[PDB]
Amino acid sequence: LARVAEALGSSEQALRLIVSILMGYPFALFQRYFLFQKETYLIHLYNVFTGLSIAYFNFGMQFFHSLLCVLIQFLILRLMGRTVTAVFTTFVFQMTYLMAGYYFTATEHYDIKWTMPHCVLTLKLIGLAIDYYDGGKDPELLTPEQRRFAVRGVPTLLEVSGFSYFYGAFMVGPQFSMTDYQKLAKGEMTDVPGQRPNSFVPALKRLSLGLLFLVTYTLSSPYISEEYLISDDYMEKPFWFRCGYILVWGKIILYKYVTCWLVTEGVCILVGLGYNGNDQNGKPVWDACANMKVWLYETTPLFTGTIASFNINTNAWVARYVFKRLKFLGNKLLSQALALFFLAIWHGLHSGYLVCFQMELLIVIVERQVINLVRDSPTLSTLASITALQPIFYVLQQTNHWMFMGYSLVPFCLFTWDKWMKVYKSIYFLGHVLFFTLLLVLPYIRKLL
Amino acid sequence: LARVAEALGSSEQALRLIVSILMGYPFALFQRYFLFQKETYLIHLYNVFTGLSIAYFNFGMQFFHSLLCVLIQFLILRLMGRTVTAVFTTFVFQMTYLMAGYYFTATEHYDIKWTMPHCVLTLKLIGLAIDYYDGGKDPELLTPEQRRFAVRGVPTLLEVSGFSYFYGAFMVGPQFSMTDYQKLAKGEMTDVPGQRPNSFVPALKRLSLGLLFLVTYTLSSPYISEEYLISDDYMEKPFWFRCGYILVWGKIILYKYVTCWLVTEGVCILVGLGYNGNDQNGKPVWDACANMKVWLYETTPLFTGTIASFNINTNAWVARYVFKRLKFLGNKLLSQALALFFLAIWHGLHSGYLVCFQMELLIVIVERQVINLVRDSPTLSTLASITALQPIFYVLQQTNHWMFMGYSLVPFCLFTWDKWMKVYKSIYFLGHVLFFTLLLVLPYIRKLL
Ligand SMILES: CCCCCCCCCCCC(=O)OC[C@@H](O)COP(=O)(O)OCC[N+](C)(C)C
Numbered sequence A, B: 001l002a003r004v005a006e007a008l009g010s011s012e013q014a015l016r017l018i019v020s021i022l023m024g025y026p027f028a029l030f031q032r033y034f035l036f037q038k039e040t041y042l043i044h045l046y047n048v049f050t051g052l053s054i055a056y057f058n059f060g061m062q063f064f065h066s067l068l069c070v071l072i073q074f075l076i077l078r079l080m081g082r083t084v085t086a087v088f089t090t091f092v093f094q095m096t097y098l099m100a101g102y103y104f105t106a107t108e109h110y111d112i113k114w115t116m117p118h119c120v121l122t123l124k125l126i127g128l129a130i131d132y133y134d135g136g137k138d139p140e141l142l143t144p145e146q147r148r149f150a151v152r153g154v155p156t157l158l159e160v161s162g163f164s165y166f167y168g169a170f171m172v173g174p175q176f177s178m179t180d181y182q183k184l185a186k187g188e189m190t191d192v193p194g195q196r197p198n199s200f201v202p203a204l205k206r207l208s209l210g211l212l213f214l215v216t217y218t219l220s221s222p223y224i225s226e227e228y229l230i231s232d233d234y235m236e237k238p239f240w241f242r243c244g245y246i247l248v249w250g251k252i253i254l255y256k257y258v259t260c261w262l263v264t265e266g267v268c269i270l271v272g273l274g275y276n277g278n279d280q281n282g283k284p285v286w287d288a289c290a291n292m293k294v295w296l297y298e299t300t301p302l303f304t305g306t307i308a309s310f311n312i313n314t315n316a317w318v319a320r321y322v323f324k325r326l327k328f329l330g331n332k333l334l335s336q337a338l339a340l341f342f343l344a345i346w347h348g349l350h351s352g353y354l355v356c357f358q359m360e361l362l363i364v365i366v367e368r369q370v371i372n373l374v375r376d377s378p379t380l381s382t383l384a385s386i387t388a389l390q391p392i393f394y395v396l397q398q399t400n401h402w403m404f405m406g407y408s409l410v411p412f413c414l415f416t417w418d419k420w421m422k423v424y425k426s427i428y429f430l431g432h433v434l435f436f437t438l439l440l441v442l443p444y445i446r447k448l449l
């Protein structure tokens, strides 16, 4: 409806996405109470129907495209099951399908179109194929976590269709594995063997936090937007103020993402999929499929402290299915680039993503070098601080972290060859030149000390 | 000059290219008579100067890009000389440079721009890198051709610069190897151990034939052009006539290529680079760096007989450095489906090339299947012919060959999504559907017989 779209002050696409995400709670409540007896095919059909309904509500003309990619893989997965070339052909097919979709969409403004659910689906399917090939090997140890994380059996059409179309983690949801989905289907993922998983208390906290972030972001949205950055006229304000804007911006655009992940956690933890075990005391731990770690993402002066708390899940998937599969190159420095290149193509086909990831690589390397210089061969360095007082150091580090994360996040939201450089040149290319000088000078001063 | 361009009836680019190609003959005549004493650096400097002048007279200010590829490789070739990763990095760098040039250069007409000399240069440099890598291995009993080609030593800047900028084979010239260039530089490519090689008699034939083809093509150029097909008002004559046009066309557009190769052969055979050995009788053989074999390209009813008579210096290079190097994977078909893909990218970035190469692959497979069915399992099918009277079969086969080679060469000269399909749909997609039906039916009828 256009009336509600104009009333809420945002485009109808975002409202439709939010209502689709929020519609998962009644589905989970219905599932948790009417499926005590298993009869797994009921769960599989229910998941398929709910996922198809969710896809039809939003993308109600092109959803059958997804129904293609599930079926074709099932053929490729069936024949040449354990050969190496199956992995190659499925990887190439999925990549070329995604690239064709991206090329034929190629919209300039940020739009929530057909692309993202298919992106999540195709990455999950590649993961499933890799896992099946890995589990097809000999039953020896092979890094026992890898052994227990593999799949053994025949993945018939019903199981793969149900696992592909989970209603909760479909749009932007967390990426689970194949082995644990069958555990949920077979009902061995509960707090105790013979009762419903008691998870009401964890879910409300996540829902409250996600709603709080959502409401504060939508309240603070009109004040700051990615149009003041150029405006063709306001590129004359005092330099410091401009930097201050980049400090206020970036920290606000991130809250657009966070909330949805948090809220989808609420629909993913209620069904019991977020169980991993108990702690030393024995109490249950529900932080298994979490996509965000609040209270560490905020207060983290280190540049590397925002890489293990922001995305966490996709990063873990990339590390597990790229680094562990390219141990025969042996360079140890090429792979860390190649993975990023893959992460620079999975997001999109524009140019801003490459520059953003290059800046992230440069900043993390510089931070590693600086933290290696101190506290390892400090001499005067540590006893100069002597831990007498570090309020000023902490606040300066925090401001530096915010400013130089927003400064590299600018090309993420503006991914055109013209607007990016037009808004980026007014800052005198500060970050790249400064960090290049630091990188080229630091070994010399380290050798001096 | 525009006056000569309008007088000759062709654009100034073609005339400039032809005059540049023809300008090599005084260079070769000067070289053959004033360089009895070797002092190799004189030859290297002469080659560099002549190649740079030729590049200047065609592409005035842009030629430095070519230099920007010769020097960088010399660095990559110097450090990490014998490692595996050197091949990977030089391959990726050359491919991405060529792709960037093509993407920034792409136009909708056939333009003689910066691309082609850089394309030849980059493919030659990739070949040099592969050959140098295959020279640092153990000197065991490899394949004799590998030992005959492998280079041992360190290529300094002068030698690589001279070998890269050969004046004769620069624009569209044949692609020789690295080891034999040093043989020419050291003066051992002669009929008699020491004297000027006797090559006047072989050379004049390649001028007579080349000039004959050139004059016939330029005389018959105005009658047939690639505009009558797409005029959209000439698509209404009866069906057969249209097919007849495709028979007359295609066989004419090919003569645009042939001549130049022939003529550059004349400037490549005079210097003595076309020597390979003697025959059984003992007379010299000069068909070493030939790029086309006339008297077999014309009268060849077989569809596979036009692959060993067209350009046999790029096909041989591809087979030597891709087809017979990816034997570790061991599929025997995927490689045949991979190398062509490389050949589908080296030509350009448009879409017509892929379809043309796919059609060539399909027709050659169909021809192989048909020739396998006959003369191997006749079953009273050919024992009755006994060569009684079959000129009709020969002429029918020749007409079929011409028609279905032109029908697949059409997308080569028209490489846009719109023009190609508009000109191709009026023929009712005859070749693809016919060959698909033949491919799907032939095994069944073979099993029947
Ligand atoms: C209150 C309004 C709610 C707004 C809805 C936005 C949902 C966040 C998208 C998360 C998708 C994802 O997992 O990729 C994470 C990153 O990749 C971010 O992705 P992008 O923001 O660049 O979107 C284009 C790239 N896709 C297509 C691959 C998703």
Ligand SMILES: CCCCCCCCCCCC(=O)OC[C@@H](O)COP(=O)(O)OCC[N+](C)(C)C
Pocket: B014, B017, B018, B115, B116, B119, B171, B172, B256, B257, B260, B346, B347, B348
């Ligand atoms: C009387 C007038 C003379 C006309 C001059 C034309 C010269 C023939 C080009 C041969 C280049 C080559 O070796 O590639 C052979 C094929 O690749 C053909 O190539 P194309 O015709 O498609 O040209 C674009 C592709 N390049 C850029 C790679 C060369």
